[PDB]
RNA sequence: CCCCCCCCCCCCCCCCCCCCCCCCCCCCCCCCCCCCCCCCCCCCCCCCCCCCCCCCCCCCCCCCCCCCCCCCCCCCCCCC
């Protein structure tokens with residue numbers, strides 16, 4: 001796992017997050033591994049991560065406290081996992097996120113408000129899920145959102161109310 | 174009891190590209206052989222023509238000699 005300013009762990013057969021890395025590491029790439037979970041305790045040492053690419057692993061669920069240990073996290077990639085369920089507290093503490101990638105997670109539906117808390121989010125990706133609607137919330141949030149990816153889902157119609165949460169959003173894509 | 178999503182490794186097949194290796198064809202150059210045409214040099218051959226030399230033949234010319242025939246002239250002697 002060679003790392004001078006960015007840490008990469010691609011195809012390293014890793015099952016748990018390594019605990020021997022420089023403290024000032026800002027980028028942690030853990031793609032194509034066997035990470036079952038991402039406990040917050042394993043990320044206590046890393047308090048300066050900006051981008052955490054954990055996609056192409058076997059994560060089934062996360063914990064909100066993980067975002068507590070990463071106050072400066074900007075890019076969070078959860079591509080190709082099985083996080084089929086989300087909660088309103090899942091992304092509450094991740095208030096400085098810019099990119100949130102959730103492609104190919106077999107998510108079936110969005111319940112109440114998983115993205116209300118974050119306000120600086122720029123792009124939200126939800127492609128290759130089982131979503132049958134564009135409903136992502138109830139109130140108006142995602143003020144600064146510019147890109148919304150909803151490709152390869154089960155959406156069959158577009159309704160005005162389902163998009164009402166983007167009243168103050170200038171969707172560039 | 175039953176699905177789906179990731180990881181490594183092993184493959185199979187179809188394309189692309191790069192390697193050596195070889196084949197066939199072609200090009201460039203050189204060499205060799207053969208054929209055709211042409212030039213140059215030297216030694217000759219045959220024929221024709223011109224000239225020259227030697228020898229010979231025939232004819233003719235000039236001169237000379239010999240013989241024959243013919244003519245003229247001189248001496249001398251007889252006959253009637």
Ligand SMILES: *[C@@H]1O[C@H](CO)[C@@H](O[C@@H]2O[C@H](CO)[C@@H](O)[C@H](O)[C@H]2NC(C)=O)[C@H](O)[C@H]1NC(C)=O
Pocket residue numbers: 008010029030031051053
């Ligand atoms: C973390 O590393 C992975 C693997 O290198 C990156 O994912 C993809 O890697 C493949 C193979 O090198 C590339 O062909 C893709 O282009 C990469 N994806 C993208 C979106 O470029 C992954 O991007 C890395 N993550 C970060 C945050 O750098």
Ligand SMILES: *[C@@H]1O[C@H](CO)[C@@H](O)[C@H](O)[C@H]1NC(C)=O
Pocket residue numbers: 140167168
């Ligand atoms: C955000 O949306 C609300 C409700 O529509 C509106 O009152 C408010 O003016 C919007 N904000 C901006 C900056 O336009």
